[PDB]
Enzyme design. Structure first.
Site, PDB file in Angstrom:
ATOM      1  N   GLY A   6       0.880  -1.220   0.185  1.00  0.00           N
ATOM      2  CA  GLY A   6      -0.008   0.067  -0.120  1.00  0.00           C
ATOM      3  C   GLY A   6       0.749   1.338   0.007  1.00  0.00           C
ATOM      4  O   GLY A   6       2.117   1.272  -0.033  1.00  0.00           O
ATOM      5  N   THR A   7       0.011   2.302  -0.096  1.00  0.00           N
ATOM      6  CA  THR A   7       0.975   3.914  -0.187  1.00  0.00           C
ATOM      7  C   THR A   7       1.351   4.228   1.277  1.00  0.00           C
ATOM      8  O   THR A   7       0.962   3.538   2.189  1.00  0.00           O
ATOM      9  CB  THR A   7      -0.121   4.746  -0.708  1.00  0.00           C
ATOM     10  OG1 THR A   7      -1.042   5.177   0.141  1.00  0.00           O
ATOM     11  CG2 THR A   7      -0.939   4.532  -1.987  1.00  0.00           C
ATOM     12  N   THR A   8       2.241   5.117   1.134  1.00  0.00           N
ATOM     13  CA  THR A   8       2.809   5.493   2.722  1.00  0.00           C
ATOM     14  C   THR A   8       1.893   6.389   3.328  1.00  0.00           C
ATOM     15  O   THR A   8       1.211   7.464   3.074  1.00  0.00           O
ATOM     16  CB  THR A   8       4.128   6.335   2.182  1.00  0.00           C
ATOM     17  OG1 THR A   8       4.986   5.599   1.283  1.00  0.00           O
ATOM     18  CG2 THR A   8       4.901   6.425   3.518  1.00  0.00           C
TER      19      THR A   8
ATOM     20  N   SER B   1      -2.499   2.221   5.705  1.00  0.00           N
ATOM     21  CA  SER B   1      -1.934   1.747   4.468  1.00  0.00           C
ATOM     22  C   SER B   1      -2.328   0.275   4.218  1.00  0.00           C
ATOM     23  O   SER B   1      -2.216  -0.600   5.017  1.00  0.00           O
ATOM     24  CB  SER B   1      -0.348   1.802   4.272  1.00  0.00           C
ATOM     25  OG  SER B   1      -0.221   3.156   4.644  1.00  0.00           O
TER      26      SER B   1
END
Ligand SMILES: [Cl-]
Lengths: 243, 250, 244, 195, 231, 241, 111, 240, 235
Positions: free
Chosen positions: A29-31, A74
């Site tokens: 996932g994204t930060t 995330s």
């Protein structure tokens, strides 16, 4: 073998492989980050702009629980929303019975026990999110990070997602350089910088920055989104540091 | 969520064996030796107190348990399984008998209730059988003294004397030579201590041996006086000192 | 989920057999033999205890023969624990009938209901069947003396003479040979003991390895008596027929 | 509803039941048969609360007929009466009890004896040589105490019954529009058409 | 492979294959397009038939006077989800006298789809939805995926060959966003968008399905001779 | 071999899931120790905070179950907290139902019974934790009772748990052989804590700063944990002797 | 003891012509001897050229109208925007009312 | 509650549990139904590996559902009791609400519906039973014969057989049964039924059961000697 | 094994796809819609000559204005018909009107996906639902166990479906009379059937606004069969 096919099964190591597999979804996932400050906490997240057709500022990812707690996560976004929905139910019943808004450590264990419960049976799947959350209560500021296993601790700074290591390194410098403490307005600026620095690990698609904060002095102990002039000021500070 | 295991975990194999019961009996075989001997005027049940650590206080762990004032139990196999069975056995003596008839159940019927509980763990959904064999000694007015063995299957048998667990094969043979129908209670205690010494390896004293009797009524252990018909429990746990006294004239 | 660990106890084989029922019958074929013989003036029940130990208390023991009511008894072959579950249900069912109609339950009705319970465990619920076969011996004023058997499938049939448990094939051939319709109880007692004595896996048939019972009209005038034999009475009847 | 009578004689049981069905100030029917055949040699008459009576009678009838088919056998009058009693004994502690009183007249083929059972809505059963429910008993019991003998024939029983109906038609306040009479014996159940 | 037997199982790389297989059912579905200006929001859908004797499967469903969606994938699953939306829109009206925000509609669908991805026995929904609406904050377009992910967009497309329309709308973004107070032109842009996803087949009169909602326009669907204007 | 996935017997009469839950116990790589004084019961545990970003005050494996009962856990924190919340609830309910404070040994038995159920029932996994309960019981005095994933429990004169548990165990055994008694013959709890730390240092062969340890103390009518400065004060006293 | 019913007064009137129909009602709303409102409408356009009024206990009246308006909405959703005929509306309202047979809506309804 | 879907489709579109239930029927003892001009006859095989039987008390193969309808079967005996019980209960329930006994078609439709329900209900296996249901509708003299099977399908038959070697006896009936002229009398119908069983059975001793159903609840079971006379007569005509 | 509600990697439900194979094994059923009415015809397919064919009931009335034909595991259709009849009558009770054919079909199709771990498996039968209402006139629907339904001008289901459907593609036009449609169903059934078509092994039915749903007699169908044979020989 076959120990990894079913949730709640111990491997010969004493490990639950299904939970470790859920951690892989989180790493994908994204930060997202969390910074603890003098009298509060700051949350920030990376939003990948997949297409021009995405409406800017209109796919909000940070979520509020009650009126004093912020949550960001995330991994599998729907799983995060399910956890926040539960968090909101837990916070509501606490306030219903005990009047006072739920303390952050109390809230942390409510999520912890709920996520831990999803590692006890083979009929459920572990959560595919690591959740950074916190806020301000009677005892001051608290920042927490919760993982798929149900494990959580208190943090001076926290990071998760694809650029977690970059963000962690940057967080550790702030802890070393500011032993007395970081201010709320400073932490917002730093949060922007760290997301921009952590974006190097996800640099195909350009991104949109989203910040929120709870502070005793700046937001009166309530969770608010950073928008407009304060957001653009934080973006400019971050832009100046990468160059 | 919810218990989705509504199906049997113990089933018949092509050869007709019930695997989980057989494997439960295997767990009992690994367990520490316990025995029971029936005398004319009493019953004795005994076992070794296998300490997990010398820092552990073995007095706090009781392998011989009172079920009713006239009924006691000992086991071989898995200790935790035994502990919960004692809890359930004590309760069922009240719920399904004492609360109905105003008196404690006879040995055979309490045994029958424990057997039922163990049978259900062999057929019900989402559970394994109990990994223990019980020896239940007791007395009641119309049947006198009796001794029963209960297995993981739920089967129970009455015994003059027997042993279960680690060295049960040798212990049963020893008891066959010594047992007669004229044994007095003290003679049965003596034979119990002799039989147990064969299976015990380390220290053999009142602190490593657990032994209880079903014998005469004990008015001094009743806790009150004034009711002539209430004369006290026939179950008594022998003290560490009382065992050592009998180990000198051994 | 839990699908992984389900044995599916209530399904058909490709040949149209019920796996678990067949395997339960295989289990029962290793249990001690039990024989029922129906005479014109009574019924005999004879059963062999499973390999006895000399320190077993023989007089205060019950393993094979159980009383359901004053007019009906059963001989058991299989898991005793399973049998006691069914016996208590049957005992209750008999009392329900008596409470409802003020008449003792007809033998077949009791047998049918107990057999219907067994059937249920083979069609639904996902549980293992009861590993038990019964021989029912009883009397009522409709059909008089009756012998039935039921097995884990829940199928039941009526008999003049029948065996369950171990060595039924050999036992049935012997019963089929010496049985005749005008037979008396005392002759049936002798036939039952002679058959066990020849089919037994033991060296010699003794009093301590047997359970015995009769259901006669040998009380006083038009009423039925159940006699569960004591150890000494089995010892005497074994001498009287010249087996020991 | 209202009047149901029963007399057990040497070889048969005779049941007499009033034909009137009244609601308010109107006799809605004068040919009502307040009885159900439970089995070939068992008959049940009934009286009580409107609706409840027929509903209960037919419910019992269905159960006995179900039993007959299942076992290919006729329950004894004693067995049927005990079943009926228990159903009423259950009913009395229900949310809404059956307010139905019944007489059960049967011939036991195994004993070769007639049998009459009186059961009220509470589940109170008694075997009697003669029986009645409601206000009828206040006249008929004393009458039968005097004229009844245990060794009477069916014809003598019918004459004894005529004496009861005559007394009720003389002293009862309501017009119950006569009775339907039915006989239960070794040959089963039959109705007397001219009474 | 060994981790696709049910939705309750993660793969070693943290994937949910049953959810991905549900996503695959959408890709097989007929193309549908969504786009909006500041005043109106438009759905355009290519309908599919079994053969020349059959009718054309209806793609667009009305949820309220101010909201509705188009579907791609398992149609019965769209019926279940649209029915849920109808109830939620309705609950908002009866209890609060409030038109359900299109954003909340998205949040509710997300959470309903999610529960079917974390429990044993169930299965994911096998359909993708494009929700359009006009509420107190103007025109909206949402994209629903049965993974649970809901996304607000200026324009988009789902189904087979949806990438053609999605690219076109990405180029046309600056033009069609400013088509304010002109329904027919916004539809024309949507009809031209879906045309970029056609192969061997062209838009006919019983093939095309258009829906529109806006400032002074209730959610209405056009089929048959009413779409002849746009061919 | 599905007999290794759920809690049913293996052919040799074993429960592999229970055995693997025992191995999860050491996943944290922390050692704990418990000893009894005359008036008190002291429990100590290692405190390892590897990440600099962690708030060290929130990192703990010692729990205050009730006013009188404390509990240290050896095993992963999620299962630890699960056990702690249940114990707190059980102890609270006991007090409400029966009118007196739940004894340490009774709570131990109850939690052991719950653990036993997970070894017998299929749908519930065992918790990968070992629970050490400590108090000064009003009847039995200083008490140490320990629970494991098998559902086993027993009282202790003293005990240790963790990867290097055996070294600590024998170290304690050798002391009680020498002293000839069941406890630490000491008046104040301060010196019993000093004994506990001293003998852990000897057994493990490591030195401890104030942030490397975690201490819980049970006295009559209260169980409490020590702060970093309370432990530092205790470390100074050991060094000056 | 709590009384769940009240009387809000007012009156309504419906007349039908050859190609039209009227449904009239006064706008006064009362409890006991007090006026609550001089203008509180109780005749409503329910869509599909159906007008409705449920007069008596206003809380029940509003609840019923609310439920029928909703019934019209779902009739469109479930039957392809088909117009609800006046005879079909009438039958539907019967089931709304009889559904609370043992705790009735205290109103006289006219459509 | 035990929920498992035991009856499910396979890749080729078969429900194996239903098809395996048909194999259980194929294992069962043969049962045959033949309807004449004014009657229906149900014949049943009884296997002779069981001597020392008590035929007084042993469950009969043909069961009365009501006084005017009968049910025979092939397959699992225990399974059939459950269907028979439910049918008997529904028969009495129909009389109670409709005030008329069941038609044979209705009773068959109910039994078939029960069988079908057990093919798509969770936690249950299908009935390993096929039934022959015969009788006469109330106040009707037209003979009725129906067949059901585990899947739940049912249909009417002029003559039909089920169980082991049923394909052999069906072959016999297909050439020996004239639709234009069914067995005009009771004797003719019983004989054709006994003949058809003699193709498969073994000895005509205590192996064949015959039950004759005539209009207006006229059902009777033949004894050994009565059946043996048909067996004796058929064999003497055969030697030609 | 595997879950009952499991998706394949191609995004289809295994059980639904497998039930479609069961329907292909079923007997043929054909429907044709005209402006004068809708015709429904089926192949009876008796498994043996001793079986009385008139007891084979594969065409069924749902209401006066709606009829239904089936193909596949026909026993599964009983509860579908029971639901359809109840839905049709219930709607008449609640709204004092005939229920739309499409609304009826949608109600039956709602049952379809109510299976899983609700019933244990999907239905193994497809339905042709034909009817008339005032709004959309004469209609023919094909209801599948997937929960999907298509309106058709003409449709064939069962073993001979793909061959019969191709024939219906050529023959159907918007001006077909009822008589023309009757002959067309018989013609196409005779082509795809195994055994020779006659009045005993095939059955016709229709639904008209005036007379409602009617199953034809064996005498009436026999004459249409004779009329069909004569017309094919006449050129
Ligand atoms: Cl407990």
């Amino acid at each position: 073998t076959g120990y990894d096919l079913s949730n709640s099964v111990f491997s010969p190591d004493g490990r639950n492989f299904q939970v470790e597999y859920a951690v892989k979804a989180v790493e994908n996932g994204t930060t997202s980050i969390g910074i603890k400050c003098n009298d509060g906490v700051v949350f920030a997240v990376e939003k990948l702009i997949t297409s021009k057709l995405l409406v800017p500022q209109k796919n909000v990812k940070i979520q509020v629980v009650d009126r004093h707690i912020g949550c960001v996560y995330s991994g599998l976004i729907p799983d995060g929303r399910h956890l926040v929905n539960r968090g909101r139910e837990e916070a509501a019943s606490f306030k219903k019975l005990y009047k006072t808004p739920i303390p952050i450590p109390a809230f942390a264990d409510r999520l912890g026990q709920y996520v831990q419960a999803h590692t006890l049976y083979n009929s459920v799947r572990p959560f595919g999110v690591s959740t950074i959350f916190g806020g301000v209560d009677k005892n001051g500021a608290h920042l927490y990070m919760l993982e798929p296993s149900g494990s959580y601790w208190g943090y001076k700074g926290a990071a998760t997602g694809k650029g977690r290591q970059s963000a962690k390194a940057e967080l550790e410098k702030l802890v070393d350089h500011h032993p007395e403490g970081l201010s709320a307005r400073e932490a917002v600026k730093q949060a922007a910088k760290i997301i921009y620095l952590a974006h190097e690990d996800n640099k195909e698609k350009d991104f949109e920055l989203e910040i929120s904060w709870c502070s005793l002095s700046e937001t009166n102990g309530l969770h608010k989104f950073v928008k407009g002039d304060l957001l653009q000021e934080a973006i400019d500070f971050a832009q100046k540091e990468i160059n | 969520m919810t218990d989705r295991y509504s199906f049997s975990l113990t089933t018949f194999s092509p050869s007709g064996k019930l695997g989980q019961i057989d494997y439960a009996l295997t767990a009992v075989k690994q367990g520490v030796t316990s025995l029971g001997i029936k005398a004319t005027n009493g019953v004795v049940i005994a076992t070794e107190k296998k300490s997990s650590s010398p820092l552990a206080m073995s007095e706090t762990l009781s392998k011989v348990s009172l079920l009713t004032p006239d009924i006691g139990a000992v086991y071989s196999g898995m200790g935790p399984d035994y502990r919960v069975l004692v809890d359930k056995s004590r309760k069922v003596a009240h719920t399904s008998y004492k609360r109905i008839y105003g008196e404690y159940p006879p040995t055979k019927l309490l045994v029958s209730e424990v057997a039922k509980i163990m049978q259900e763990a062999t057929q019900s959904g989402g559970v394994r059988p109990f990994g223990v064999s019980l020896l239940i000694a007791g007395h009641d007015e119309f049947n006198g003294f009796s001794l029963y063995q209960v297995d993981p299957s739920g089967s129970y048998f009455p015994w003059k004397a027997t042993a279960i667990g680690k060295g049960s094969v040798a212990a049963k043979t020893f008891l066959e030579k010594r047992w007669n129908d004229e044994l007095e209670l003290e003679d049965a205690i003596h034979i119990a201590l002799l039989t147990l010494k064969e299976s015990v390896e380390g220290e053999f004293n009142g602190d490593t041996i657990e032994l209880a009797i079903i014998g005469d009524e004990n008015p001094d252990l009743l806790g009150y006086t004034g009711i002539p018909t209430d004369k006290g429990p026939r179950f008594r746990k022998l003290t560490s000192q009382e065992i050592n006294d009998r180990l000198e004239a051994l | 989920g839990s699908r992984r660990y389900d044995s599916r106890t209530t399904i058909f084989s490709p040949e149209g057999r019920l796996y678990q029922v067949e395997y339960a019958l295989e289990s029962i074929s290793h249990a001690g033999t039990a024989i029922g013989i129906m005479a014109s003036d009574g019924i005999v029940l004879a059963a062999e205890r499973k390999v006895t130990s000399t320190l077993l208390e023989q007089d205060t023991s019950t393993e094979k023969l159980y009383k359901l009511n004053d007019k009906i008894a059963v001989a058991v072959a299989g898991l005793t624990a399973d049998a006691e579950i069914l016996i208590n249900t049957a005992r209750i069912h008999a009392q329900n009938y008596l409470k409802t109609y003020n008449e003792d339950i007809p033998v077949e009705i009791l047998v049918r209901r107990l057999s219907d319970i067994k059937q249920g465990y083979t069609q639904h619920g996902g549980l293992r069947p009861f590993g038990v076969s019964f021989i029912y011996a009883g009397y009522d004023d409709r059909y008089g003396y009756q012998l039935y058997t039921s097995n884990p499938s829940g199928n039941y049939t009526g008999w003049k003479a029948i065996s369950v448990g171990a060595n039924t094939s050999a036992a049935q051939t012997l019963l089929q040979m010496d049985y005749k319709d005008d037979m008396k109880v005392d002759d049936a007692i002798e036939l039952a003991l002679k058959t066990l004595s020849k089919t037994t896996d033991s060296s010699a048939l003794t009093y301590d390895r047997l359970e015995f019972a009769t259901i006669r009209k040998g009380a006083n005038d038009g009423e039925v008596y159940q006699k569960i034999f004591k150890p000494q009475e089995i010892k005497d009847i074994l001498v009287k027929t010249g087996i020991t | 509803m209202d009047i149901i009578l029963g007399i057990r004689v040497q070889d048969s049981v005779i049941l007499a039941s009033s034909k009137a069905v009244t609601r308010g100030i109107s006799v809605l029917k004068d040919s009502d048969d307040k009885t159900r055949q439970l089995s070939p040699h068992t008959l049940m008459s009934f009286a009580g609360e409107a609706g409840d009576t027929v509903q209960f009678a037919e419910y019992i009838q269905a159960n006995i007929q179900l039993y007959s088919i299942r076992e290919d056998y006729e329950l004894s009058p004693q067995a049927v009466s005990s079943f009926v009693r228990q159903e009423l004994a259950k009913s009395i502690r229900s949310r809404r009890p059956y307010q139905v009183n019944v007489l059960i007249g049967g011939y036991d083929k195994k004993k070769n004896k007639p049998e009459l059972y009186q059961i009220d809505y509470l589940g109170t059963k008694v075997e009697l040589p003669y029986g009645a429910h409601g206000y009828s008993g206040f006249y008929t019991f004393s009458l039968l105490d005097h004229h009844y003998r245990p060794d009477m024939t069916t014809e003598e029983g019918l004459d004894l019954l005529k004496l009861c109906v005559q007394e009720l038609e003389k002293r009862m306040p309501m017009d119950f529009k006569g009775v339907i009479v039915k006989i239960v014996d070794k040959d089963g159940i039959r109705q007397v058409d001219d009474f | 492979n060994n981790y696709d037997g049910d939705t309750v199982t993660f793969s070693p790389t943290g994937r949910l294959f049953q959810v991905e297989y549900a996503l695959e059912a959408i890709k097989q579905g007929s193309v549908t397009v969504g786009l909006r200006s500041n005043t109106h929001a438009v759905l355009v859908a290519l309908k599919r038939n079994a053969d020349e004797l059959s009718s054309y499967q209806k793609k667009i469903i009305k949820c309220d006077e101010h909201m509705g969606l188009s579907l791609a994938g398992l149609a019965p699953d769209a019926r279940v989800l649209s029915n849920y939306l109808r109830q939620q829109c309705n609950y908002s009206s009866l209890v609060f006298n409030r038109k359900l925000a299109v954003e909340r509609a998205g949040h509710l669908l997300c959470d309903k789809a999610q529960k079917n991805t974390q429990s044993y026995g169930g299965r994911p929904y096998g359909v993708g939805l494009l929700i359009i609406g006009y509420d107190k904050s103007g025109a909206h377009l949402l994209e629903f995926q049965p993974s649970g992910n809901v996304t607000e967009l200026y324009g988009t497309a789902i189904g087979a060959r949806s990438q053609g329309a999605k690219t076109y709308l990405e180029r046309t973004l600056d033009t069609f966003i400013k088509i304010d107070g002109n329904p027919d032109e916004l539809i024309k842009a949507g009809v031209e968008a879906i045309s970029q996803s056609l192969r061997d087949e062209s838009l006919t009169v019983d093939n095309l399905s258009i829906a529109i909602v806006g400032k002074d326009t209730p959610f209405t669907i056009y089929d048959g001779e009413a779409v002849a204007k746009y061919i | 071999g599905y007999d290794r996935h759920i809690t049913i017997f293996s052919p040799e009469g074993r429960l592999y899931q229970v055995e693997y839950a025992f191995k999860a116990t050491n996943q944290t790589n922390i050692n704990s120790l418990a000893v009894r004084g005359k008036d008190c019961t002291v429990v100590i545990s290692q405190k390892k905070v590897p990440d600099k970003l962690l708030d060290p005050t929130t990192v703990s494996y010692i729990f205050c179950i009730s006013r009188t009962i404390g509990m240290v856990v050896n095993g992963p924190i999620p299962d630890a907290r699960n056990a702690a919340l249940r114990a707190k609830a059980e102890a609270a309910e006991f007090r409400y139902k029966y009118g007196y404070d739940m004894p340490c040994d009774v709570l131990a038995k109850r939690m052991a019974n719950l653990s036993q159920i997970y070894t017998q029932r299929a749908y519930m996994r065992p918790l990968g934790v070992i629970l050490t309960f400590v108090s000064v019981d009003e009847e039995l005095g200083p008490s140490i009772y320990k629970t494991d994933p098998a559902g086993y429990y027993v009282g202790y004169k003293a005990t240790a748990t963790g990867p290097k548990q055996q070294e600590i165990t024998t170290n304690l055994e050798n002391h009680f052989k020498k002293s000839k008694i069941d406890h630490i013959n000491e008046e104040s709890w301060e010196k019993v804590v000093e004994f506990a730390i001293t003998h852990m240092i000897d057994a493990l062969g490591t030195e401890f700063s104030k942030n490397d340890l975690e201490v819980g103390v049970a006295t009559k009518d209260k169980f409490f944990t020590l702060s970093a400065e309370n432990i530092e004060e205790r470390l100074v006293a050991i060094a000056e002797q | 003891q709590f009384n769940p019913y009240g009387d809000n007064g007012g009156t309504i009137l419906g007349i039908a012509g050859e190609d039209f129909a009227v449904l009239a009602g006064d706008t006064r709303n009362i409890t006991d001897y007090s006026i609550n409102s001089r203008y509180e409408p109780k005749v409503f356009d329910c869509g599909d050229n159906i007008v409705m009024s449920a007069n008596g206990f206003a809380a029940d009246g509003d609840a019923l109208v609310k439920r029928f308006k909703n019934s019209v909405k779902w009739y469109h959703f479930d039957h392809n925007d088909k117009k609800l005929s006046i005879n079909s509306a009438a039958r539907n309202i019967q089931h709304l009312l009889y559904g609370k047979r043992f705790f009735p809506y205290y109103v006289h309804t006219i459509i | 509650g035990y929920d498992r879907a035991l009856s499910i489709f396979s890749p080729d579109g078969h429900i194996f549990q239903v098809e395996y239930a048909l194999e259980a029927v194929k294992r069962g003892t043969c049962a045959v139904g033949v309807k004449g001009k004014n009657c229906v006859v149900l014949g049943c095989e009884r296997r002779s590996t069981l001597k020392l039987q008590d035929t007084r008390i042993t469950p009969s193969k043909v069961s009365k559902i009501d006084s005017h309808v009968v049910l025979s079967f092939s397959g699992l005996n225990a399974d059939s009791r459950i269907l028979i019980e439910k049918a008997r209960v529904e028969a009495q329930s129909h009389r109670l609400t409709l005030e008329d006994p069941v038609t044979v078609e209705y009773l068959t439709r109910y039994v078939a519906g029960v069988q079908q329900r057990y093919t798509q209900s969770g936690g249950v296996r299908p009935f390993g039973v096929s039934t022959l249901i015969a009788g006469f509708d109330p106040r009707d003299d037209e003979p009725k014969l129906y067949q059901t099977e585990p899947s739940g399908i049912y249909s009417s038959w002029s003559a039909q057989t089920i169980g082991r070697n049923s394909k052999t006896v069906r072959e016999f009936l297909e050439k020996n049964y004239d639709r234009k002229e069914p067995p005009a009398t009771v004797e003719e119908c019983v004989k054709l039924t006994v003949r058809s069983l003699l193709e498969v059975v073994q000895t005509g001793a205590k192996n064949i059961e015959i039950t004759v159903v005539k209009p207006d609840s006229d059902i009777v079971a033949l004894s050994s000697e009565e059946i043996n006379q048909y067996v004796t007569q058929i064999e003497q005509e055969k030697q030609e | 094994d595997r879950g009952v509600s499991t998706f394949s990697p191609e995004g289809r439900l295994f059980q639904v796809e497998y039930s479609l194979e069961a329907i292909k094994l079923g007997s043929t059923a054909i429907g044709i819609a005209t402006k004068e009415g809708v015709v429904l015809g089926v192949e009876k397919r008796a498994t043996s000559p001793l079986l009385e064919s008139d007891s084979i009931e594969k065409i069924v009335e749902i209401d006066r204005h709606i009829g239904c034909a089936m193909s596949g595991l026909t026993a599964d259709a009983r509860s579908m018909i029971e639901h359809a009849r109840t839905a049709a009558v219930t709607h008449n009770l609640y709204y004092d009107e005939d229920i739309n054919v499409e609304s009826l079909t949608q109600s039956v199709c709602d049952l379809a996906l109510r299976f899983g771990e609700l019933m244990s498996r999907p239905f193994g039968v497809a339905l042709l639902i034909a009817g008339h209402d005032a709004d959309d006139g004469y209609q023919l629907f094909h209801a599948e166990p997937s929960g999907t339904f298509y309106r058709y001008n003409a449709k064939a289901i069962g073993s001979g479906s793909e061959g019969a459907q191709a024939e219906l593609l050529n023959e159907w036009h918007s001006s077909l009379t009822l008589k023309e449609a009757e002959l067309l169903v018989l013609k196409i059934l005779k082509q795809v059937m195994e055994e020779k078509l006659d009045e005993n092994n095939a059955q016709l039915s229709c639904i008209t606004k005036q007379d409602g749903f009617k199953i034809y007699d064996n005498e009436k169908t026999a004459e249409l069969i004779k009329e069909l044979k004569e017309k094919e020989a006449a050129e």
